[PDB]
Design an enzyme around this catalytic site. Structure first.
Site, PDB file in Angstrom:
ATOM      1  N   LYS A  43      -5.892  -6.653  -0.783  1.00 23.46           N
ATOM      2  CA  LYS A  43      -6.346  -7.688  -1.716  1.00 23.46           C
ATOM      3  C   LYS A  43      -5.302  -7.940  -2.802  1.00 23.46           C
ATOM      4  O   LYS A  43      -5.195  -9.041  -3.330  1.00 23.46           O
ATOM      5  CB  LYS A  43      -7.702  -7.331  -2.266  1.00 23.46           C
ATOM      6  CG  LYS A  43      -8.788  -7.472  -1.215  1.00 23.46           C
ATOM      7  CD  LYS A  43     -10.075  -6.769  -1.475  1.00 23.46           C
ATOM      8  CE  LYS A  43     -11.122  -7.050  -0.434  1.00 23.46           C
ATOM      9  NZ  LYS A  43     -12.271  -6.080  -0.454  1.00 23.46           N
ATOM     10  N   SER A  83     -13.289  -5.283  -5.740  1.00 23.07           N
ATOM     11  CA  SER A  83     -13.094  -5.217  -4.303  1.00 23.07           C
ATOM     12  C   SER A  83     -13.985  -6.203  -3.540  1.00 23.07           C
ATOM     13  O   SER A  83     -14.414  -5.925  -2.450  1.00 23.07           O
ATOM     14  CB  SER A  83     -13.265  -3.780  -3.784  1.00 23.07           C
ATOM     15  OG  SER A  83     -12.412  -3.647  -2.648  1.00 23.07           O
ATOM     16  N   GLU A  87     -12.430 -10.165   6.211  1.00 25.02           N
ATOM     17  CA  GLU A  87     -13.425  -9.195   5.839  1.00 25.02           C
ATOM     18  C   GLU A  87     -14.733  -9.504   6.543  1.00 25.02           C
ATOM     19  O   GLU A  87     -15.115 -10.681   6.598  1.00 25.02           O
ATOM     20  CB  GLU A  87     -13.713  -9.223   4.342  1.00 25.02           C
ATOM     21  CG  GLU A  87     -12.591  -8.673   3.484  1.00 25.02           C
ATOM     22  CD  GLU A  87     -12.377  -7.198   3.560  1.00 25.02           C
ATOM     23  OE1 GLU A  87     -13.062  -6.502   4.360  1.00 25.02           O
ATOM     24  OE2 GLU A  87     -11.476  -6.644   2.809  1.00 25.02           O
ATOM     25  N   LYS A  99      -5.420  -0.224  -6.811  1.00 23.70           N
ATOM     26  CA  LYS A  99      -6.409  -0.847  -5.915  1.00 23.70           C
ATOM     27  C   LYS A  99      -6.701   0.133  -4.815  1.00 23.70           C
ATOM     28  O   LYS A  99      -5.713   0.624  -4.171  1.00 23.70           O
ATOM     29  CB  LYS A  99      -5.894  -2.150  -5.286  1.00 23.70           C
ATOM     30  CG  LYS A  99      -6.879  -2.811  -4.359  1.00 23.70           C
ATOM     31  CD  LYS A  99      -8.032  -3.494  -5.117  1.00 23.70           C
ATOM     32  CE  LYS A  99      -9.175  -3.835  -4.209  1.00 23.70           C
ATOM     33  NZ  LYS A  99     -10.017  -2.653  -3.889  1.00 23.70           N
ATOM     34  N   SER A 100      -7.972   0.438  -4.611  1.00 28.06           N
ATOM     35  CA  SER A 100      -8.328   1.354  -3.571  1.00 28.06           C
ATOM     36  C   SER A 100      -8.840   0.632  -2.349  1.00 28.06           C
ATOM     37  O   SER A 100      -8.974  -0.602  -2.309  1.00 28.06           O
ATOM     38  CB  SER A 100      -9.261   2.392  -4.082  1.00 28.06           C
ATOM     39  OG  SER A 100     -10.375   1.798  -4.691  1.00 28.06           O
ATOM     40  N   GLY A 101      -9.007   1.430  -1.293  1.00 22.74           N
ATOM     41  CA  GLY A 101      -9.600   0.882  -0.065  1.00 22.74           C
ATOM     42  C   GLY A 101     -10.428   1.919   0.646  1.00 22.74           C
ATOM     43  O   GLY A 101     -10.192   3.124   0.531  1.00 22.74           O
ATOM     44  N   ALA A 102     -11.443   1.434   1.339  1.00 22.67           N
ATOM     45  CA  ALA A 102     -12.292   2.280   2.220  1.00 22.67           C
ATOM     46  C   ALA A 102     -12.557   1.500   3.509  1.00 22.67           C
ATOM     47  O   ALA A 102     -12.687   0.263   3.511  1.00 22.67           O
ATOM     48  CB  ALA A 102     -13.584   2.638   1.562  1.00 22.67           C
TER      49      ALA A 102
END
Length: 266
Positions: free
Chosen positions: A48, A105, A141, A209-212
């Protein structure tokens, strides 16, 4: 307090999964430490940031406006869309969509932004144009989070991602104003608390920025440093683990703790 590379290896043992790590000097771009830097990992929501880089590049070129308001519908809404689900009547501006995609997110925000550029192939083309021929976005997404083992769709390498982030935040790729907006969104991230942020001392700066994703995928991209100023880029990814979200978060937070504890080393 384990050294960072020792901790990264330990995280693999704990998680039963591969972990990729790189740490760059922000100013020079030199690699300070790495582990599996050239293995491919699902990006998940870390993409993102790159998407909003592409959008800002269009803004800089007069092809897009921060204030442009996009109205959308119920049909556009997908899972993990906490901001866009509250703006069906009023719509959202491009600036608001980027804030939502990075700081919350928001998945639908990301899809709306991908439409503005013409789809995932166009994000990949933006990346190629600036010299990253490894990072690739293939899907929208939420399917881009599938993380089928060893599937290269929607992946990056730590070494590719770290340098792409450095180029977006400090390079000439974006205007000063746009570089600053991108980092400001990342600083305002609200969706990464149990990760690197959990290890940070008072007084530090972090833009992240994280992600899962599926298959235990988890990761984070960050620019961080002491004394209110970022000085290093850190990229961490893992995929494959059967461990819980809290266990995966804990391992990333511990890698962060090791990075912070040894930061002063010459």
């Amino acid at each position: 307090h384990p050294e960072t590379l020792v901790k990264v290896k330990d995280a693999e043992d704990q998680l039963g999964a591969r972990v990729g790590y790189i740490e760059l000097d922000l100013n020079s771009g030199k690699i300070l430490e790495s582990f599996r830097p050239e293995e491919r990992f699902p990006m998940m929501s870390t993409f993102k940031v790159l998407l909003c880089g592409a959008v800002l590049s269009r803004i800089d070129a007069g092809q897009e406006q921060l204030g442009r308001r996009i109205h959308y519908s119920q049909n556009d809404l997908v899972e993990y869309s906490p901001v866009t689900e509250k703006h069906l009547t009023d719509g959202m501006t491009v600036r608001e969509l980027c804030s939502a995609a990075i700081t919350m997110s928001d998945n639908t925000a990301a899809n709306l932004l991908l439409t503005t550029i013409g789809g995932p192939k166009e994000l990949t083309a933006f990346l190629h144009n600036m010299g990253d021929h490894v990072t690739r976005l293939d899907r929208w997404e939420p399917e881009l989070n599938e993380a089928i083992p060893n599937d290269e769709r929607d992946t990056t390498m730590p070494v590719a991602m770290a340098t792409t982030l450095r180029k977006l935040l400090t390079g000439e790729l974006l205007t000063l104003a746009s570089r600053q907006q991108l980092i400001d969104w990342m600083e305002a991230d609200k969706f990464a608390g149990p990760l690197l942020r959990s290890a940070l001392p008072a007084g530090w700066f972090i833009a992240d920025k994280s992600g899962a994703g599926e298959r235990g995928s988890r990761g984070i991209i960050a620019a961080l440093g002491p004394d209110g100023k970022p000085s290093r880029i850190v990229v961490i990814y893992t995929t494959g683990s059967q461990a819980t979200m809290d266990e995966r978060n804990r391992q990333i937070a511990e890698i962060g703790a090791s990075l912070i504890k040894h930061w002063a080393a010459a």
